[PDB]
Every structure is written in structure tokens, then in C-alpha cells.
Amino acid sequence: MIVPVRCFSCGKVVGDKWESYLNLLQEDELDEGTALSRLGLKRYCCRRMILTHVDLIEKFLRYNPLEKR
Amino acid sequence: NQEDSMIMNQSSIDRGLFRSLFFRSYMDQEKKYGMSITETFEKPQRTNT
Amino acid sequence: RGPNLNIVLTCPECKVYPPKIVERFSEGDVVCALCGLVLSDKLVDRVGEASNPLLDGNNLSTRIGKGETTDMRFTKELNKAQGKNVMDKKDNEVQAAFAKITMLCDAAELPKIVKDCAKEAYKLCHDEKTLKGKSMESIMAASILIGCRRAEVARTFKEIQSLIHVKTKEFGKTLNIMKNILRGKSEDGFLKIDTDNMSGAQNLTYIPRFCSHLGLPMQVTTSAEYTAKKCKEIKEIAGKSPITIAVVSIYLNILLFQIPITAAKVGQTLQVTEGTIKSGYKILYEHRDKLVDPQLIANGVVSLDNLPGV
Amino acid sequence: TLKYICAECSSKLSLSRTDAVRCKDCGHRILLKARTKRLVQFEAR
Amino acid sequence: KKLMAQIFFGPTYYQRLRHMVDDKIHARARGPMQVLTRQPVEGRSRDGG
Amino acid sequence: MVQQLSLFGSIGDDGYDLLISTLTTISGNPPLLYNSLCTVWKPNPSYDVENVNSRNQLVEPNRIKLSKEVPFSYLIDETMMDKPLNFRILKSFTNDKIPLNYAMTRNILHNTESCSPWSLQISDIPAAGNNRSVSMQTIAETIILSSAGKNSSVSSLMNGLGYVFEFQYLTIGVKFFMKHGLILELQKIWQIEEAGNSQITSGGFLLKAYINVSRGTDIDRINYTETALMNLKKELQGYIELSVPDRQSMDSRVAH
Ligand SMILES: [Mg+2]
Ligand SMILES: [Zn+2]
Ligand SMILES: [Zn+2]
Ligand SMILES: [Zn+2]
């Protein structure tokens, strides 16, 4: 839904790396493995935590808010 | 983990492995059986209900 | 009168009346809450058929139909058996009248609350000596009108006459007789507060349906409701029929919102004389300030200069 | 008396018992009861 | 200590199935009885037998 | 966690000396004049309480009582110093006239530094089992020894624990310590009020024959004390009747 705060296996904080991962993908033209390595995810548990994350929160956000202030 | 059991990581469970939301919806109606026989939504009181 | 046959379930040790009793459903127990003594155990919380003893009474009957292996000569003889019964002729005719009520409400696509209210109104006004010579279609029409008014889904005499070919005079006579019978039944049994349900005008309930028939927006419908509410304060037009009041308020708000629907089209849709609509608009033209909803002109969605003069 | 929000126009409304359950601004018939004003406690686990 | 055997190790896709033990755990010492047979009722939601 | 195995009765004022002589013959012990000013505290009605406790068991609010002696110089009205303190002084106490009054009991309660010793007793309704021939009640009691501070009055301490004063009574009587730990008390009770004292035991003495057992789980001890009470009852038949009083009477819970 939204990127997890920590890696499930080891507990490395990965929730701060999602925007930089997307930026390395879309404006530095790196492939995903080099992007993960540049973020510093060397364990494949941490690599799949970002690589396999499906970020459904903007799909949820395209709907109008039910309570609007 | 014998006979198809599995050992899951409690630390991974704490960090959110396979955590899920469960939603259950309860639907209720107020219906009019007759003239004065009508259901109504209100907070009931033990003195008169 | 008669035997008591009532179980008063009290704690035999606390000796407190009224007893403080907890019915523990999950444990199947009834306990005294003061001391915890179990008074009665093995509590009883599908297999039959539903029957409401208010609509068709305490009538229990089963029909005969084809099974897995059924010869048709035996079914035809048994079907004539239930028909050739003299004890339940009144039950048969009241069920036929309920069937007519249901088919009329289905042809009108009225809701189930209207069907139930009309059926109960017919059952309460049935077999009354004051209602014997009136025609059955008039009984049906008056019961349908009473059901609509009681469900606040009120239609008009023109609607019920479009459904049922009934003469207007004895329709009104039947409606008056059944209203008297229903008030007598309410006084005899359970008493009901009217709170403006049987009222003859009910002009606020006709605005949304007529606006839907004309294809008007929701804000135009709400402004027409406000205008129809404020027309009651006007003495000269409060004596008019509620249909006419609703139609002239709707037409005034149509002219206010520049909806391209002519008075002839409104009259053809709502079965009101175009001259009557024009006269109502020309007499409500004088009271423009009170009728038109004030925050509409405050927000500027409409202006009072849009209405054509007389 | 009690606070409701329309389904799609997100308008705030106050309803009593005798009020019909409909939206007054756009005419929609689906209203959601408002989020409670009290603080709600969640363990962060 | 090192395990004498080396372990086949790596990511695998797993699915959380909807049979949770909390939706299936059920016990009844005494409870409601059926209307007809006055036997314990059916279902864990009805505190049955 | 004591249990009181108890029987109750009453006598008139005329038969008081006859019962004193009879019980002297029964026990071999002279009667013992005693008093205990009992002050009763109920939970504060301005305090919203929960029916549950720290655990998940739901309980009723209960009146909890504080009892202590009063010196007999405070009960002598400056006219009977000469007669010694014995069973004979209870014949004079028949009416509502008691020298201990509401002002002085208020002075005792408010301590107007250190406070006198008290006994804090909490008692529930007796057991509902209709198979015991004697009234069995459960009493939990502490001994409040001393107090200090600027807020050292025992009434304000009871307020701090959350209990306000409801009523108080002074009981004066004589007791016998007879065979095998049976305490039989014979007492008058006066309610102490600002409107005036009132003799609750009007025209007679109340009788309470009780045995304290530390472990009510010990069924052998319970049965032994019960059959000692019935032995006393059999010995006392013909003259006075011992019977179990009402559990609704012995209940000290706050009704609502
Ligand atoms: Mg299996
Ligand atoms: Zn990791
Ligand atoms: Zn009880
Ligand atoms: Zn809306």
C-alpha cells in the first residue's frame, strides 16, 4: 500500500529510501539493481523490500476524500 | 514445522509481515410491519425497553 | 379471568421484588445478579413458515402442487377441494382483494410499505356496515390513497384515477368513510398521532415527483419546495388545490432558473390547464419577494428580474 | 443534532430524529456519520 | 554454532490464507439449546456444541 | 480471613440479672463489661465508582466500619463513680440518656495529632447456604494504630480512602468467655446523632454468641464450633431461644 518503514527480515529502515529509489529510476536512468545498490541495500531481503513493493497509496489517493476540511 | 507446519519470524510479524486489515459490515433496517408496529433506530434505555 | 399460567422468575434466596435477573445466553443460564444463583438452566434460543397475524389473521393453510412423481388427475380433484369450501369464503375474498391491492401497487410500482399500509387499511375497513354498497374498485383506490398518505408517499386523486377507473364522487365518499372507520379503529385500539400524514393538501410531497417528471434539477426542486411552503402564508392562493399550488410554484421556479420548459409542456406533463398555470403565475408575480428563497439571490444563482412581467 | 457528511459532495449536515436522511445541498441519499471527536488510543505495535 | 547441513535459503512468494485460528477456535461448556430437540445449537457464532 | 459462627437472641431488662447468674453458672466466669464505639463509613456518593474491581470480578459497594473503646469515665455522668464497673451498671442504662454525645464523638473522630487505635471491620452478607444451623459471616479487619500530619484526623483519612461518615452507634454490654473459645455478648446499642441519642435495643438486651475461626476452609473446625453453638443452644432451651437472624438484616451493603 505504502512503503514499509523497516525491512521485514532484519529491520533496516527502508521507508526513507522510496522517493530516492523512484528518483534514481526515473531521472538518473539507472536500472533497479544499481538503484538499490546506490541506496545501500546489499542484503537481498532489503533489496526485495523496495523492489517488490507495490505502492498502491496513490491509487487510493485518486479517490476523493470522504471527509474534506 | 513438521506435518506442513511452518516457523514464522516473530520479528518480521512485528515489523509487518502478512499483517492484514479485516472489515466486516453489519447491515440493519427499520421496517414497518403495520401502523404502530414500526422499528426505530434509537439508543434504548433499560427502564422502558 | 382465567388461569394465571405465568412463571414469575425470582431468586428464592434474595427475596427481592423486582428481581435483578441476567439472562446469560452464551452460557444457557438465567441467574440472579445479586447472588449468582442459577434459577433456570438449559435456555432455549428454519422449520416452519412466516405468518403475520395482523395482515391475514390467524389463518393456517397449505396448497397442493405437483411433486416429484405426481399424476395430474389427483391434483385437479384436490385443487377443487380447497376452492369448494364454504367456511373460508370471507378469507378467500379478502385474499383476492389483497391480491388486487398488490397487483395495482405493482403496476404503479409503489413500495412495499405502501402495499402493507393499503392491505392493513383494507383489512381494518373490511366487513364494516357503513362500507357495503361502495364499489370494490373504489375501496381499492381509497385504500391505496390511504396507504400512500400513511407511508408519506402520498399520490393524488388524479394518479389513483389514472390507475383505477373510478368515479370521483364515490371515490371521495369511500375515502371519507374509510378515514372515519380507521379513526374509529385507532380510538378503539392503539392510538396513533397523525403528525400531518392524512392531510389533504400535502403539497410538499408532490414537488419532487413533479420535478422528476419534468426533469428539473435538485436546486430547482428545493426552491419549488420553498415556494410551495411559502404559498401557504398567501391567503388568496392557499384555497387552491395542492396540485395547482405545486405546479405554479414549479413553473415560477422554472422561469426563475431559465429552464427551457414551456407552460404548455408543464401542463401536458402534469395534467393542469395552461390557463390555470398562467393565472397562478400572474397572481404569484406580486409576491415575488417572499416566495423566492433568499440565499439563492444572496449567492446570485437566480435573480428576481428574470421572471417575466404581467 | 448529530453530524453527517454527504457521500459525494462532502457537505456537512446536522440531523435530528424527524429529519429525512437525505442531503440538503445535492439531494443525495447516502450520508456517513461523522468521525468521533474523542481521542482514540492505539498501541503502536 | 554452524549447522552441519547447509540450508536452501531465499525469497519465496507466500499467500496469507483467510483461515485464521481465531475465526475457528470454539469451546462450549454449556450454552443455548435448540428449540425443537433441546440439543446444543450449531455454529461457533451461536456458542454452539 | 476470619469467620464468625454466630447465634442471636434477645432478653428483657427484668431477666437480665437472671441470665447473668445463669451464664455465670454455665461458664464459671464473671461477666465482663465492655464498650466499642462503632463509626460506619459508606463510599462517597459524589465519587463515580465502577462495579468492577482491579480484577474482572464485579462487586457491590460496602459500608466499612471503625470500632474502638470509649473510657468509662466518659460514660459515667458524674453520679456513679462509687459503684464499680460491673454487670450491675447496665440496669441504669434503659432510656436514651447517654453521656457520650454527638459533639464529643465528632471531637473523637476529628482528633481535636496522633489518633487512638481503631479496628477497621468489613463484613459481607452471611452465607446463603441453607444447610448451616448457625449464621456464618465473613469479616476482614485491620488494626489502625496511629496517624500523623496536618490532615491526621481519622475522618479525613477515611475521606482520603474515599468513604464518608454515615452513622455511628455506641454499644455497651457484658461478655462471657466460656468453654472452648465461645464468646457470648449481651449488649445495649445507642445510635449517636446530632438530633439526639436513641436506644435501639429498647427495653431489652441483645444476645450474640459467636466463635471466631481463622480458617473457614477447615470444615472440621467449622463443624466443631457449630456443634459447640448447638450444645449451648440445647443447654439454653426452655429459658431463651437461639435463632439465626436475617441475612438481609446482617447485610451491610449500600442499596441502590
Ligand atoms: Mg490436513
Ligand atoms: Zn533486510
Ligand atoms: Zn439471589
Ligand atoms: Zn450531497
From Swiss-Prot, chain A:
InterPro entries per record: RNA_pol_su_RPB10, RNA_pol_suN_Zn-BS, RPABC5/Rpb10
Question: Which keywords are on file for this protein?
Answer: DNA-directed RNA polymerase, Isopeptide bond, Metal-binding, Nucleus, Ribosome biogenesis, Transcription, Ubl conjugation, Zinc
Its annotated compartments are: Nucleus, Nucleolus
- According to the lineage, what is the superkingdom? Eukaryota
For the keyword Metal-binding, the answer is yes
Q: Which GO terms describe its molecular function?
A: DNA binding; DNA-directed RNA polymerase activity; zinc ion binding
Keyword check for Transcription, yes or no.
yes
Locate the cross-link: Glycyl lysine isopeptide (Lys-Gly) (interchain with G-Cter in ubiquitin).
59
Kindly list the cysteine pairs connected by disulfide bridges.
Answer: none
Extract the PROSITE patterns matched here: RNA_POL_N_8KD
What do the Gene Ontology cellular component annotations say?
Answer: nucleoplasm; nucleus; RNA polymerase I complex; RNA polymerase II, core complex; RNA polymerase III complex
Oligomeric form and interacting partners: Component of the RNA polymerase I (Pol I), RNA polymerase II (Pol II) and RNA polymerase III (Pol III) complexes. Component of the RNA polymerase I (Pol I) complex consisting of 14 subunits: RPA135, RPA190, RPC40, RPA14, RPB5, RPO26, RPA43, RPB8, RPA12, RPB10, RPC19, RPC10, RPA49 and RPA34. The complex is composed of a horseshoe-shaped core containing ten subunits (RPA135, RPA190, RPB5, RPO26, RPB8, RPB10, RPC10, RPA12, RPC19 and RPC40) where RPA135 and RPA190 form the DNA-binding cleft.
PANTHER family from the UniProt entry: DNA-DIRECTED RNA POLYMERASES I, II, AND III SUBUNIT RPABC5 (PTHR23431:SF3), DNA-DIRECTED RNA POLYMERASES I, II, AND III SUBUNIT RPABC5 FAMILY MEMBER (PTHR23431)
The record's similarity note reads: Belongs to the archaeal Rpo10/eukaryotic RPB10 RNA polymerase subunit family.
Task: Output this protein's name.
Answer: DNA-directed RNA polymerases I, II, and III subunit RPABC5
Q: What is the lineage of its organism?
A: Eukaryota, Fungi, Dikarya, Ascomycota, Saccharomycotina
Q: Which gene encodes it?
A: RPB10
Swiss-Prot record, chain B:
Which residues are listed for Mg(2+) binding in this entry? 4
Q: Relate the protein's function as given in its record.
A: DNA-dependent RNA polymerase catalyzes the transcription of DNA into RNA using the four ribonucleoside triphosphates as substrates. Second largest component of RNA polymerases II which synthesizes mRNA precursors and many functional non-coding RNAs. Proposed to contribute to the polymerase catalytic activity and forms the polymerase active center together with the largest subunit. Pol II is the central component of the basal RNA polymerase II transcription machinery.
User: Coiled-coil region(s) at which residues?
Assistant: none
Q: Name its species.
A: Saccharomyces cerevisiae (strain ATCC 204508 / S288c)
Signal peptide range: none
Gene this chain is encoded by: RPB2
Q: What is this protein called?
A: DNA-directed RNA polymerase II subunit RPB2
Q: What is the similarity comment for this entry?
A: Belongs to the RNA polymerase beta chain family.
Q: What stretch of the whole protein does this chain cover?
A: 834 to 882 of 1224
Q: Superkingdom of the source?
A: Eukaryota
> Oligomeric state and partners?
Component of the RNA polymerase II (Pol II) complex consisting of 12 subunits.
Q: Where is the protein localized?
A: Nucleus
- The portions of this protein that span the membrane are none
A further note on this protein reads:
The binding of ribonucleoside triphosphate to the RNA polymerase II transcribing complex probably involves a two-step mechanism. The initial binding seems to occur at the entry (E) site and involves a magnesium ion coordinated by three conserved aspartate residues of the two largest RNA Pol II subunits. Present with 18700 molecules/cell in log phase SD medium.
Curated annotation (Swiss-Prot), chain C:
* Binding positions (Zn(2+)): 11, 14, 32, 35
Q: sequence repeat positions in this chain?
A: 104-180, 210-286
Further information in the entry reads: Present with 6750 molecules/cell in log phase SD medium.
Q: What does this protein do?
A: General factor that plays a major role in the activation of eukaryotic genes transcribed by RNA polymerase II.
Q: Which UniProt keywords apply?
A: Metal-binding, Nucleus, Repeat, Transcription, Transcription regulation, Zinc, Zinc-finger
Quaternary context: Associates with TFIID-IIA (DA complex) to form TFIID-IIA-IIB (DAB-complex) which is then recognized by polymerase II.
- A cellular component term, taken from the record's GO annotations: transcription preinitiation complex
GO terms in the biological process aspect are: DNA-templated transcription initiation; RNA polymerase II preinitiation complex assembly; transcription open complex formation at RNA polymerase II promoter; transcriptional start site selection at RNA polymerase II promoter
Report the SMART domains cross-referenced here: CYCLIN
Could you identify this protein by its name? Transcription initiation factor IIB
Q: Which family does the entry's similarity section mention?
A: Belongs to the TFIIB family.
Q: Which domain of life is it from?
A: Eukaryota
List the TFIIB-type ZnF regions, as residue ranges: 7-40
Q: Recall the GO molecular function terms of this protein's record.
A: RNA polymerase II complex binding; RNA polymerase II complex recruiting activity; RNA polymerase II general transcription initiation factor activity; TBP-class protein binding; zinc ion binding
Where's it found, cell-wise? Nucleus
Q: Where are the transmembrane segments?
A: none
**Which Pfam families did the record assign?**
TFIIB, Zn_Ribbon_TF
Q: Which organism is this protein's natural source? A: Saccharomyces cerevisiae (strain ATCC 204508 / S288c) (Baker's yeast)
Q: Which SUPFAM superfamilies match?
A: Cyclin-like (SSF47954), Zinc beta-ribbon (SSF57783)
From Swiss-Prot, chain D:
Give the UniProt subcellular location, in the record's own words: Nucleus, Nucleolus; Peroxisome
Q: What is its main location?
A: nucleus
List the C4-type zinc finger ranges: 6-26
Q: What is this protein called?
A: DNA-directed RNA polymerases I, II, and III subunit RPABC4
- Annotated family: Belongs to the archaeal Rpo12/eukaryotic RPC10 RNA polymerase subunit family.
Gene Ontology molecular function: DNA binding; DNA-directed RNA polymerase activity; zinc ion binding
Q: Name one GO biological process term.
A: transcription elongation by RNA polymerase I
Q: Does the keyword rRNA-binding apply?
A: no
Q: What assembly does the database describe for this protein?
A: Component of the RNA polymerase I (Pol I), RNA polymerase II (Pol II) and RNA polymerase III (Pol III) complexes. Component of the RNA polymerase I (Pol I) complex consisting of 14 subunits: RPA135, RPA190, RPC40, RPA14, RPB5, RPO26, RPA43, RPB8, RPA12, RPB10, RPC19, RPC10, RPA49 and RPA34. The complex is composed of a horseshoe-shaped core containing ten subunits (RPA135, RPA190, RPB5, RPO26, RPB8, RPB10, RPC10, RPA12, RPC19 and RPC40) where RPA135 and RPA190 form the DNA-binding cleft.
Q: Give the record's PTM text.
A: The N-terminus is blocked.
What keywords is this UniProt entry annotated with?
A: DNA-directed RNA polymerase, Metal-binding, Nucleus, Peroxisome, Ribosome biogenesis, Transcription, Zinc, Zinc-finger
Q: Does the keyword Nucleus apply?
A: yes
Q: Taxonomic lineage of this organism? A: Eukaryota, Fungi, Dikarya, Ascomycota, Saccharomycotina
Where does it sit, as one GO cellular component term?
Answer: RNA polymerase III complex
Miscellaneous comment as given in the Swiss-Prot or TrEMBL entry: Present with 907 molecules/cell in log phase SD medium.
Point out the gene that encodes the protein: RPC10
Q: Which residues bind Zn(2+)?
A: 6, 9, 23, 26
